Amino acid sequence: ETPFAPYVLSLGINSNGTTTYYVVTAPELMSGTINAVAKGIEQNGYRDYEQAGQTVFSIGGLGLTSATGIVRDANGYLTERGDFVFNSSLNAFTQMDGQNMIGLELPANKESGDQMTLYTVNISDVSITSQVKAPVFPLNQLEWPSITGMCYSEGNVYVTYFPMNPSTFETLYTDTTFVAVYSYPDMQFKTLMKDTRTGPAGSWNAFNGIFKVESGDMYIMSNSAIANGFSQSTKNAAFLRIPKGETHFDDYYFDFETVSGGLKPAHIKYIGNGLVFAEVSTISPQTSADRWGDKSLKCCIIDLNNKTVRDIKEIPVHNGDGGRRFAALVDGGYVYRPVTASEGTYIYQVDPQAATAVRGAKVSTTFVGGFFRLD
Ligand SMILES: [Fe+3]
């Protein structure tokens, strides 16, 4: 175990048909193999990792209903500090300010309850400091919702979702972008922004529905990607913009599916100044055989201002991590992405201005669940 190592990798290694996560440190992303032998902390069950401040929340799932805090010890090592509990699942989870995390929790289906809970959790304490519930009604007006992201802006909680039959996983309403706004402290429904320019914003359990930028404005991505969980695709994949602290879409439109060549993006990560590191599906005819597959992904740089998509030719076509948080680190003006190639899984460094990549450290794992950096 390297002391004071800055990079944090959550190596998800599958054994005996079940995945175990090893949260390990790494001092370098270019040479030397990143392994979990005699190093890293073990975590069982299904965990997904989200960082804010200097804390990494390991949120459980598939039955796991606890979120554990991982911080840097005074000795430079990683240590588990603080945990908070819930009853169902954290359907969405971001931060609103420098000290509190906002989290939206939906029931599994209508018969499981008609109340959704919003937790305000302290980042430093890793504990629920506030919670308020609200009705689900303006989310299941078409069908029981599946959340794809949530973020805060000027006292308003914005929740992007798509209607999905919770039993058959059938998405019939794919030609209208839906996003519901709520007053923050009351969690009171305000409006349901619908937009008939593209389909729903985001993908199943992908957390790629909405993201805000430096100006405070927020962007949403619609893909209707069958390969990422949808049953059909009626509209084109594109990006829309909701201004800072508003409840109406502006005249911004970035038709990604046509400007790309019939490709729909699978994962996105805003890296700053209108640039987004994206994994897009190289499958042009997204058939139902490709559903839930997220296979044959290509890394690209998306310029929102100039509305361009540039291929990162140095990263080979690979299969994605499915419906899960996108594991990419925006550090030192570069974007670091673990790519599982034929020879193995390698950390690729991506220069966004040149849209170029350099293969870095090899990582000994099945996949990565979280890629973070601590100081
Ligand atoms: Fe599942």
mmCIF file of C-alpha atoms and ligand atoms in Angstrom:
data_model
loop_
_atom_site.group_PDB
_atom_site.id
_atom_site.type_symbol
_atom_site.label_atom_id
_atom_site.label_comp_id
_atom_site.label_asym_id
_atom_site.label_seq_id
_atom_site.Cartn_x
_atom_site.Cartn_y
_atom_site.Cartn_z
ATOM 1 C CA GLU A 1 0.000 0.000 0.000
ATOM 2 C CA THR A 2 1.443 3.338 -1.108
ATOM 3 C CA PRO A 3 1.040 6.101 1.503
ATOM 4 C CA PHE A 4 -0.471 9.425 0.423
ATOM 5 C CA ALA A 5 -1.224 8.001 -3.025
ATOM 6 C CA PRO A 6 -3.576 10.448 -4.771
ATOM 7 C CA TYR A 7 -5.568 8.273 -7.182
ATOM 8 C CA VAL A 8 -8.430 6.077 -5.955
ATOM 9 C CA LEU A 9 -9.617 3.124 -8.046
ATOM 10 C CA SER A 10 -12.501 0.828 -7.108
ATOM 11 C CA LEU A 11 -11.523 -2.478 -8.716
ATOM 12 C CA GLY A 12 -14.609 -4.625 -9.195
ATOM 13 C CA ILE A 13 -13.299 -8.193 -9.455
ATOM 14 C CA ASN A 14 -15.707 -11.047 -10.155
ATOM 15 C CA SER A 15 -15.091 -14.352 -8.377
ATOM 16 C CA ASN A 16 -17.339 -17.400 -7.953
ATOM 17 C CA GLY A 17 -19.965 -15.566 -10.013
ATOM 18 C CA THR A 18 -20.220 -12.615 -7.595
ATOM 19 C CA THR A 19 -18.480 -9.248 -7.771
ATOM 20 C CA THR A 20 -16.326 -7.991 -4.884
ATOM 21 C CA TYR A 21 -14.994 -4.428 -4.869
ATOM 22 C CA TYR A 22 -11.494 -3.467 -3.723
ATOM 23 C CA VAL A 23 -10.989 0.250 -3.095
ATOM 24 C CA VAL A 24 -7.265 0.725 -3.726
ATOM 25 C CA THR A 25 -4.852 3.632 -4.069
ATOM 26 C CA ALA A 26 -2.520 4.437 -6.962
ATOM 27 C CA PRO A 27 0.335 6.973 -7.171
ATOM 28 C CA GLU A 28 0.580 6.900 -10.977
ATOM 29 C CA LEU A 29 -1.689 6.447 -13.996
ATOM 30 C CA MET A 30 0.961 5.870 -16.700
ATOM 31 C CA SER A 31 3.268 3.014 -15.661
ATOM 32 C CA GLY A 32 3.130 0.182 -13.160
ATOM 33 C CA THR A 33 0.204 -2.194 -12.769
ATOM 34 C CA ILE A 34 -2.693 -1.235 -10.486
ATOM 35 C CA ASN A 35 -3.537 -4.381 -8.513
ATOM 36 C CA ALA A 36 -5.371 -5.237 -5.294
ATOM 37 C CA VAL A 37 -2.954 -7.792 -3.806
ATOM 38 C CA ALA A 38 -2.111 -6.929 -0.173
ATOM 39 C CA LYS A 39 -3.561 -3.444 -0.824
ATOM 40 C CA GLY A 40 -7.004 -1.869 -0.732
ATOM 41 C CA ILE A 41 -10.128 -2.269 1.390
ATOM 42 C CA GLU A 42 -12.698 -4.966 0.623
ATOM 43 C CA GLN A 43 -16.410 -4.349 0.048
ATOM 44 C CA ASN A 44 -19.077 -6.965 -0.656
ATOM 45 C CA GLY A 45 -22.451 -6.708 -2.339
ATOM 46 C CA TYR A 46 -23.182 -4.233 -5.116
ATOM 47 C CA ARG A 47 -21.537 -0.835 -4.586
ATOM 48 C CA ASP A 48 -21.492 2.293 -6.746
ATOM 49 C CA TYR A 49 -19.118 5.139 -5.952
ATOM 50 C CA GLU A 50 -19.700 8.910 -5.997
ATOM 51 C CA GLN A 51 -17.229 11.542 -4.789
ATOM 52 C CA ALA A 52 -17.691 15.010 -3.324
ATOM 53 C CA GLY A 53 -15.321 17.191 -1.355
ATOM 54 C CA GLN A 54 -12.772 14.731 0.019
ATOM 55 C CA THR A 55 -15.278 11.909 0.599
ATOM 56 C CA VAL A 56 -16.168 8.943 -1.612
ATOM 57 C CA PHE A 57 -19.634 7.531 -0.935
ATOM 58 C CA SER A 58 -19.950 3.798 -1.606
ATOM 59 C CA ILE A 59 -23.722 3.491 -2.034
ATOM 60 C CA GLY A 60 -25.068 -0.038 -1.927
ATOM 61 C CA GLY A 61 -27.602 -1.546 -4.262
ATOM 62 C CA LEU A 62 -29.403 -4.741 -5.212
ATOM 63 C CA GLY A 63 -30.599 -5.061 -1.636
ATOM 64 C CA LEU A 64 -27.779 -3.097 -0.020
ATOM 65 C CA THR A 65 -29.402 -0.025 1.541
ATOM 66 C CA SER A 66 -26.406 1.700 3.141
ATOM 67 C CA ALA A 67 -23.920 4.351 2.031
ATOM 68 C CA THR A 68 -20.412 4.135 3.497
ATOM 69 C CA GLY A 69 -17.949 7.026 3.571
ATOM 70 C CA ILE A 70 -14.368 6.558 2.369
ATOM 71 C CA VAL A 71 -11.913 9.342 3.224
ATOM 72 C CA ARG A 72 -8.152 9.785 3.435
ATOM 73 C CA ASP A 73 -6.721 8.943 6.845
ATOM 74 C CA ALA A 74 -4.190 11.142 8.615
ATOM 75 C CA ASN A 75 -1.608 8.477 7.688
ATOM 76 C CA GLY A 76 -2.289 9.007 3.969
ATOM 77 C CA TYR A 77 -4.258 5.757 3.639
ATOM 78 C CA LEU A 78 -7.901 5.266 2.690
ATOM 79 C CA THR A 79 -10.289 4.535 5.555
ATOM 80 C CA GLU A 80 -14.019 3.996 5.994
ATOM 81 C CA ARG A 81 -15.553 6.856 8.005
ATOM 82 C CA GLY A 82 -19.276 7.360 8.521
ATOM 83 C CA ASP A 83 -22.308 5.583 7.086
ATOM 84 C CA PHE A 84 -25.980 6.402 6.583
ATOM 85 C CA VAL A 85 -28.908 4.084 5.935
ATOM 86 C CA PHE A 86 -32.021 4.084 3.749
ATOM 87 C CA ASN A 87 -34.717 1.517 2.969
ATOM 88 C CA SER A 88 -34.966 1.065 -0.815
ATOM 89 C CA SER A 89 -32.338 2.610 -3.106
ATOM 90 C CA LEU A 90 -30.645 5.914 -3.930
ATOM 91 C CA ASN A 91 -32.227 6.583 -7.318
ATOM 92 C CA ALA A 92 -30.291 9.853 -7.600
ATOM 93 C CA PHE A 93 -27.479 11.447 -5.615
ATOM 94 C CA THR A 94 -25.502 14.659 -6.204
ATOM 95 C CA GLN A 95 -24.297 17.653 -4.184
ATOM 96 C CA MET A 96 -25.991 21.039 -3.854
ATOM 97 C CA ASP A 97 -23.387 22.961 -1.833
ATOM 98 C CA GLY A 98 -19.890 22.327 -0.489
ATOM 99 C CA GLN A 99 -21.190 20.521 2.605
ATOM 100 C CA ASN A 100 -24.433 18.692 1.758
ATOM 101 C CA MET A 101 -25.454 15.917 -0.621
ATOM 102 C CA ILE A 102 -28.965 15.711 -2.067
ATOM 103 C CA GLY A 103 -30.451 12.285 -2.695
ATOM 104 C CA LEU A 104 -33.715 11.125 -4.260
ATOM 105 C CA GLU A 105 -35.204 7.718 -3.412
ATOM 106 C CA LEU A 106 -38.193 6.197 -5.294
ATOM 107 C CA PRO A 107 -40.169 3.066 -4.406
ATOM 108 C CA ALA A 108 -39.616 -0.026 -6.514
ATOM 109 C CA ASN A 109 -43.135 0.210 -7.978
ATOM 110 C CA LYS A 110 -46.553 1.716 -7.287
ATOM 111 C CA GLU A 111 -47.609 -1.038 -4.875
ATOM 112 C CA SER A 112 -44.360 -0.511 -2.945
ATOM 113 C CA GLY A 113 -45.590 2.956 -1.935
ATOM 114 C CA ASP A 114 -46.522 6.351 -3.355
ATOM 115 C CA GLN A 115 -43.960 8.441 -1.437
ATOM 116 C CA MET A 116 -40.455 9.408 -2.557
ATOM 117 C CA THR A 117 -37.862 10.640 -0.073
ATOM 118 C CA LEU A 118 -35.251 13.388 -0.443
ATOM 119 C CA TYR A 119 -32.282 13.100 1.920
ATOM 120 C CA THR A 120 -29.913 15.961 2.711
ATOM 121 C CA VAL A 121 -26.772 14.261 4.037
ATOM 122 C CA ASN A 122 -23.707 15.932 5.511
ATOM 123 C CA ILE A 123 -20.572 15.331 3.450
ATOM 124 C CA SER A 124 -18.183 15.575 6.405
ATOM 125 C CA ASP A 125 -20.320 13.547 8.833
ATOM 126 C CA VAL A 126 -21.763 11.039 6.319
ATOM 127 C CA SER A 127 -25.143 11.169 8.048
ATOM 128 C CA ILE A 128 -28.675 12.240 7.155
ATOM 129 C CA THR A 129 -29.108 15.778 8.496
ATOM 130 C CA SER A 130 -32.503 16.301 6.858
ATOM 131 C CA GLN A 131 -35.143 14.323 5.010
ATOM 132 C CA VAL A 132 -38.496 15.164 3.439
ATOM 133 C CA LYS A 133 -40.855 13.035 1.361
ATOM 134 C CA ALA A 134 -43.215 13.978 -1.453
ATOM 135 C CA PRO A 135 -45.778 12.366 -3.764
ATOM 136 C CA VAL A 136 -44.637 10.508 -6.862
ATOM 137 C CA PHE A 137 -47.688 11.426 -8.958
ATOM 138 C CA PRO A 138 -46.180 13.819 -11.547
ATOM 139 C CA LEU A 139 -43.609 11.130 -12.366
ATOM 140 C CA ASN A 140 -45.844 8.099 -13.028
ATOM 141 C CA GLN A 141 -48.435 10.101 -14.990
ATOM 142 C CA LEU A 142 -47.391 8.097 -18.073
ATOM 143 C CA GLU A 143 -45.602 5.160 -16.410
ATOM 144 C CA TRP A 144 -43.637 4.428 -13.248
ATOM 145 C CA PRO A 145 -40.491 6.572 -13.489
ATOM 146 C CA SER A 146 -36.877 5.490 -13.706
ATOM 147 C CA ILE A 147 -34.461 8.242 -12.679
ATOM 148 C CA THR A 148 -31.469 9.126 -14.859
ATOM 149 C CA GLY A 149 -29.991 12.004 -12.854
ATOM 150 C CA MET A 150 -30.693 14.940 -10.570
ATOM 151 C CA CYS A 151 -28.971 18.227 -9.765
ATOM 152 C CA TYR A 152 -29.511 21.462 -7.846
ATOM 153 C CA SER A 153 -29.802 24.984 -9.256
ATOM 154 C CA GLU A 154 -30.935 28.175 -7.489
ATOM 155 C CA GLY A 155 -33.158 26.547 -4.890
ATOM 156 C CA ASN A 156 -34.691 24.037 -7.311
ATOM 157 C CA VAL A 157 -34.204 20.273 -7.543
ATOM 158 C CA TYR A 158 -34.289 19.049 -11.150
ATOM 159 C CA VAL A 159 -34.977 15.349 -11.743
ATOM 160 C CA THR A 160 -34.608 13.735 -15.171
ATOM 161 C CA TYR A 161 -36.281 10.381 -15.738
ATOM 162 C CA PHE A 162 -38.083 8.218 -18.248
ATOM 163 C CA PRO A 163 -41.299 6.199 -17.891
ATOM 164 C CA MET A 164 -40.591 2.469 -17.781
ATOM 165 C CA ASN A 165 -42.922 -0.457 -17.095
ATOM 166 C CA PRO A 166 -41.274 -1.678 -13.866
ATOM 167 C CA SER A 167 -42.218 -5.320 -14.579
ATOM 168 C CA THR A 168 -41.499 -5.744 -18.308
ATOM 169 C CA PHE A 169 -38.986 -2.856 -18.616
ATOM 170 C CA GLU A 170 -40.920 -1.453 -21.581
ATOM 171 C CA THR A 171 -40.475 2.221 -22.515
ATOM 172 C CA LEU A 172 -43.385 3.286 -24.728
ATOM 173 C CA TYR A 173 -43.082 7.081 -24.345
ATOM 174 C CA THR A 174 -39.741 7.861 -25.997
ATOM 175 C CA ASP A 175 -40.654 10.999 -27.990
ATOM 176 C CA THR A 176 -40.849 13.544 -25.152
ATOM 177 C CA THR A 177 -38.086 14.770 -22.844
ATOM 178 C CA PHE A 178 -39.380 14.856 -19.260
ATOM 179 C CA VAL A 179 -37.814 16.587 -16.267
ATOM 180 C CA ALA A 180 -39.591 17.515 -13.027
ATOM 181 C CA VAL A 181 -38.683 20.514 -10.864
ATOM 182 C CA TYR A 182 -39.225 20.761 -7.113
ATOM 183 C CA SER A 183 -38.791 23.445 -4.481
ATOM 184 C CA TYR A 184 -35.766 22.324 -2.494
ATOM 185 C CA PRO A 185 -36.634 22.478 1.234
ATOM 186 C CA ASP A 186 -40.301 21.483 0.844
ATOM 187 C CA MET A 187 -39.735 19.044 -2.049
ATOM 188 C CA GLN A 188 -42.948 20.455 -3.512
ATOM 189 C CA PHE A 189 -43.691 19.742 -7.164
ATOM 190 C CA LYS A 190 -43.520 22.886 -9.311
ATOM 191 C CA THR A 191 -43.604 21.971 -13.011
ATOM 192 C CA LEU A 192 -42.920 19.096 -15.391
ATOM 193 C CA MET A 193 -40.782 20.441 -18.218
ATOM 194 C CA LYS A 194 -41.677 18.467 -21.337
ATOM 195 C CA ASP A 195 -39.901 19.022 -24.648
ATOM 196 C CA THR A 196 -40.937 17.462 -27.961
ATOM 197 C CA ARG A 197 -37.599 17.993 -29.735
ATOM 198 C CA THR A 198 -36.012 14.699 -28.606
ATOM 199 C CA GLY A 199 -36.781 11.723 -26.391
ATOM 200 C CA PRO A 200 -36.336 11.232 -22.651
ATOM 201 C CA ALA A 201 -33.195 12.515 -20.947
ATOM 202 C CA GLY A 202 -30.774 9.808 -19.843
ATOM 203 C CA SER A 203 -30.508 6.038 -19.592
ATOM 204 C CA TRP A 204 -31.444 3.369 -17.056
ATOM 205 C CA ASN A 205 -29.320 3.624 -13.886
ATOM 206 C CA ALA A 206 -26.696 5.482 -15.951
ATOM 207 C CA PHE A 207 -26.879 8.843 -14.098
ATOM 208 C CA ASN A 208 -26.285 10.563 -17.462
ATOM 209 C CA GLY A 209 -29.517 12.556 -17.499
ATOM 210 C CA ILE A 210 -28.416 16.056 -16.495
ATOM 211 C CA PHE A 211 -25.260 17.954 -15.556
ATOM 212 C CA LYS A 212 -24.604 21.626 -14.838
ATOM 213 C CA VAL A 213 -21.603 23.608 -16.056
ATOM 214 C CA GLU A 214 -19.514 26.539 -14.817
ATOM 215 C CA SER A 215 -22.121 29.142 -15.806
ATOM 216 C CA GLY A 216 -24.754 27.450 -13.633
ATOM 217 C CA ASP A 217 -26.786 26.446 -16.687
ATOM 218 C CA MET A 218 -27.657 22.771 -16.980
ATOM 219 C CA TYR A 219 -27.499 20.396 -19.936
ATOM 220 C CA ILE A 220 -29.485 17.218 -20.496
ATOM 221 C CA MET A 221 -28.694 14.374 -22.882
ATOM 222 C CA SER A 222 -31.351 12.322 -24.660
ATOM 223 C CA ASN A 223 -30.285 9.145 -26.405
ATOM 224 C CA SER A 224 -33.235 6.708 -26.535
ATOM 225 C CA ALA A 225 -30.457 4.139 -26.850
ATOM 226 C CA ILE A 226 -31.849 0.607 -26.988
ATOM 227 C CA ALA A 227 -28.349 -0.688 -26.223
ATOM 228 C CA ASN A 228 -28.555 1.178 -22.888
ATOM 229 C CA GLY A 229 -31.903 -0.203 -21.725
ATOM 230 C CA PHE A 230 -34.668 1.270 -23.869
ATOM 231 C CA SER A 231 -37.271 -0.762 -25.748
ATOM 232 C CA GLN A 232 -37.558 1.670 -28.668
ATOM 233 C CA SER A 233 -36.176 4.874 -30.161
ATOM 234 C CA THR A 234 -38.478 7.415 -31.811
ATOM 235 C CA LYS A 235 -36.540 10.701 -31.650
ATOM 236 C CA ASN A 236 -32.894 11.544 -32.253
ATOM 237 C CA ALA A 237 -30.170 11.641 -29.622
ATOM 238 C CA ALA A 238 -29.256 15.215 -28.731
ATOM 239 C CA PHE A 239 -28.441 17.694 -25.969
ATOM 240 C CA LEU A 240 -30.781 20.319 -24.537
ATOM 241 C CA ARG A 241 -30.100 23.243 -22.207
ATOM 242 C CA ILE A 242 -32.063 24.560 -19.225
ATOM 243 C CA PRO A 243 -30.797 28.009 -18.128
ATOM 244 C CA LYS A 244 -29.514 28.785 -14.653
ATOM 245 C CA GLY A 245 -32.368 28.659 -12.157
ATOM 246 C CA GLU A 246 -35.133 28.452 -14.777
ATOM 247 C CA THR A 247 -37.983 26.061 -15.596
ATOM 248 C CA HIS A 248 -38.088 26.272 -19.397
ATOM 249 C CA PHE A 249 -35.862 24.941 -22.169
ATOM 250 C CA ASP A 250 -34.060 27.584 -24.218
ATOM 251 C CA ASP A 251 -33.566 27.605 -27.998
ATOM 252 C CA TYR A 252 -30.422 25.457 -27.705
ATOM 253 C CA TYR A 253 -30.422 22.247 -29.743
ATOM 254 C CA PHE A 254 -27.435 19.952 -30.408
ATOM 255 C CA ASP A 255 -28.612 17.080 -32.636
ATOM 256 C CA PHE A 256 -25.917 14.558 -31.702
ATOM 257 C CA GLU A 257 -27.299 11.527 -33.550
ATOM 258 C CA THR A 258 -27.198 13.203 -36.971
ATOM 259 C CA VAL A 259 -23.929 15.098 -36.460
ATOM 260 C CA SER A 260 -22.280 11.841 -35.339
ATOM 261 C CA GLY A 261 -23.460 9.552 -38.143
ATOM 262 C CA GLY A 262 -26.305 7.615 -36.568
ATOM 263 C CA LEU A 263 -24.552 6.968 -33.244
ATOM 264 C CA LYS A 264 -26.102 7.418 -29.807
ATOM 265 C CA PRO A 265 -23.968 8.285 -26.765
ATOM 266 C CA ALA A 266 -23.874 5.804 -23.896
ATOM 267 C CA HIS A 267 -21.980 7.723 -21.196
ATOM 268 C CA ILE A 268 -20.990 11.363 -20.702
ATOM 269 C CA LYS A 269 -18.760 13.262 -18.276
ATOM 270 C CA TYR A 270 -18.494 17.048 -18.398
ATOM 271 C CA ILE A 271 -14.814 18.009 -18.295
ATOM 272 C CA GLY A 272 -15.186 21.792 -18.486
ATOM 273 C CA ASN A 273 -15.613 24.714 -20.896
ATOM 274 C CA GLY A 274 -18.187 23.080 -23.153
ATOM 275 C CA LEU A 275 -16.174 19.854 -23.497
ATOM 276 C CA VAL A 276 -17.578 16.434 -22.576
ATOM 277 C CA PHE A 277 -15.769 13.096 -22.526
ATOM 278 C CA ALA A 278 -18.238 10.620 -24.009
ATOM 279 C CA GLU A 279 -18.531 6.926 -24.762
ATOM 280 C CA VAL A 280 -20.816 6.507 -27.783
ATOM 281 C CA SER A 281 -22.224 3.304 -29.258
ATOM 282 C CA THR A 282 -20.716 2.360 -32.627
ATOM 283 C CA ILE A 283 -23.825 0.260 -33.371
ATOM 284 C CA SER A 284 -25.811 2.283 -35.902
ATOM 285 C CA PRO A 285 -28.925 0.039 -36.086
ATOM 286 C CA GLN A 286 -29.657 -0.331 -32.366
ATOM 287 C CA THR A 287 -31.739 -3.515 -32.411
ATOM 288 C CA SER A 288 -33.441 -5.251 -29.505
ATOM 289 C CA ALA A 289 -30.684 -7.875 -29.642
ATOM 290 C CA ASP A 290 -28.252 -5.131 -28.568
ATOM 291 C CA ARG A 291 -30.453 -4.155 -25.611
ATOM 292 C CA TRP A 292 -28.854 -3.858 -22.156
ATOM 293 C CA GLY A 293 -25.565 -4.597 -23.909
ATOM 294 C CA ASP A 294 -23.727 -1.272 -24.125
ATOM 295 C CA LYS A 295 -21.183 -2.956 -26.395
ATOM 296 C CA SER A 296 -18.728 -1.568 -28.955
ATOM 297 C CA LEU A 297 -18.181 1.865 -27.427
ATOM 298 C CA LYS A 298 -15.959 4.598 -28.851
ATOM 299 C CA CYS A 299 -14.449 7.476 -26.885
ATOM 300 C CA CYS A 300 -15.152 10.971 -28.178
ATOM 301 C CA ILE A 301 -14.823 14.636 -27.269
ATOM 302 C CA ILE A 302 -18.116 16.539 -27.466
ATOM 303 C CA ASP A 303 -17.886 20.304 -27.978
ATOM 304 C CA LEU A 304 -21.233 21.726 -26.872
ATOM 305 C CA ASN A 305 -20.439 25.301 -27.918
ATOM 306 C CA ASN A 306 -19.279 24.467 -31.452
ATOM 307 C CA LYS A 307 -21.550 21.369 -31.459
ATOM 308 C CA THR A 308 -18.960 18.861 -32.672
ATOM 309 C CA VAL A 309 -18.061 15.248 -31.907
ATOM 310 C CA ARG A 310 -14.445 14.170 -32.443
ATOM 311 C CA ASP A 311 -13.351 10.540 -32.267
ATOM 312 C CA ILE A 312 -10.480 9.577 -29.964
ATOM 313 C CA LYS A 313 -8.792 7.221 -32.421
ATOM 314 C CA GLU A 314 -6.150 6.011 -29.939
ATOM 315 C CA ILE A 315 -8.752 4.289 -27.712
ATOM 316 C CA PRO A 316 -9.935 0.938 -29.129
ATOM 317 C CA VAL A 317 -13.571 -0.021 -29.555
ATOM 318 C CA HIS A 318 -14.636 -1.610 -26.272
ATOM 319 C CA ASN A 319 -17.695 -2.643 -24.281
ATOM 320 C CA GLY A 320 -18.964 -0.291 -21.597
ATOM 321 C CA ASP A 321 -19.735 -0.829 -17.924
ATOM 322 C CA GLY A 322 -23.495 -0.902 -18.570
ATOM 323 C CA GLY A 323 -26.044 1.099 -16.620
ATOM 324 C CA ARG A 324 -23.785 2.493 -13.905
ATOM 325 C CA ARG A 325 -21.892 5.632 -12.915
ATOM 326 C CA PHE A 326 -19.377 6.592 -15.599
ATOM 327 C CA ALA A 327 -15.850 5.889 -14.313
ATOM 328 C CA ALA A 328 -13.720 8.752 -15.623
ATOM 329 C CA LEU A 329 -11.360 11.142 -13.832
ATOM 330 C CA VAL A 330 -10.942 14.773 -14.915
ATOM 331 C CA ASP A 331 -7.488 15.620 -13.567
ATOM 332 C CA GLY A 332 -4.800 18.078 -14.623
ATOM 333 C CA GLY A 333 -6.555 19.029 -17.848
ATOM 334 C CA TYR A 334 -6.766 15.387 -18.950
ATOM 335 C CA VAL A 335 -9.481 12.729 -18.836
ATOM 336 C CA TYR A 336 -8.478 9.296 -17.536
ATOM 337 C CA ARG A 337 -10.693 6.377 -18.560
ATOM 338 C CA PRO A 338 -10.172 2.645 -17.894
ATOM 339 C CA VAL A 339 -10.759 0.800 -21.177
ATOM 340 C CA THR A 340 -11.139 -2.991 -21.253
ATOM 341 C CA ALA A 341 -9.396 -4.001 -24.479
ATOM 342 C CA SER A 342 -8.637 -7.459 -25.873
ATOM 343 C CA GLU A 343 -5.216 -7.718 -24.214
ATOM 344 C CA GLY A 344 -6.454 -6.309 -20.918
ATOM 345 C CA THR A 345 -7.788 -3.266 -19.097
ATOM 346 C CA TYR A 346 -5.654 -0.129 -19.422
ATOM 347 C CA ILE A 347 -5.968 3.426 -18.132
ATOM 348 C CA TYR A 348 -6.067 5.780 -21.124
ATOM 349 C CA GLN A 349 -5.167 9.456 -20.771
ATOM 350 C CA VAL A 350 -7.187 11.728 -23.055
ATOM 351 C CA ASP A 351 -6.101 15.182 -24.219
ATOM 352 C CA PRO A 352 -9.414 16.945 -24.928
ATOM 353 C CA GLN A 353 -8.076 19.746 -27.139
ATOM 354 C CA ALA A 354 -6.301 17.315 -29.466
ATOM 355 C CA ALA A 355 -8.885 14.567 -28.804
ATOM 356 C CA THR A 356 -5.923 12.215 -28.477
ATOM 357 C CA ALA A 357 -5.118 9.361 -26.118
ATOM 358 C CA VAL A 358 -2.071 7.685 -24.594
ATOM 359 C CA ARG A 359 -2.265 4.247 -23.000
ATOM 360 C CA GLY A 360 -1.188 4.407 -19.373
ATOM 361 C CA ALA A 361 -1.140 1.975 -16.471
ATOM 362 C CA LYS A 362 -2.556 -1.520 -16.816
ATOM 363 C CA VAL A 363 -5.140 -2.349 -14.144
ATOM 364 C CA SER A 364 -5.695 -5.903 -12.873
ATOM 365 C CA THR A 365 -9.471 -6.116 -12.457
ATOM 366 C CA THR A 366 -12.663 -7.064 -14.258
ATOM 367 C CA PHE A 367 -13.887 -3.451 -14.314
ATOM 368 C CA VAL A 368 -13.727 -0.186 -12.365
ATOM 369 C CA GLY A 369 -16.580 1.156 -10.269
ATOM 370 C CA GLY A 370 -15.030 4.457 -9.244
ATOM 371 C CA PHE A 371 -12.098 6.600 -10.405
ATOM 372 C CA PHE A 372 -11.389 9.522 -8.067
ATOM 373 C CA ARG A 373 -8.578 11.663 -6.663
ATOM 374 C CA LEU A 374 -7.978 12.929 -3.124
ATOM 375 C CA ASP A 375 -5.613 15.523 -1.670
HETATM 376 FE FE FE B 1 -30.246 -5.416 -12.542
#
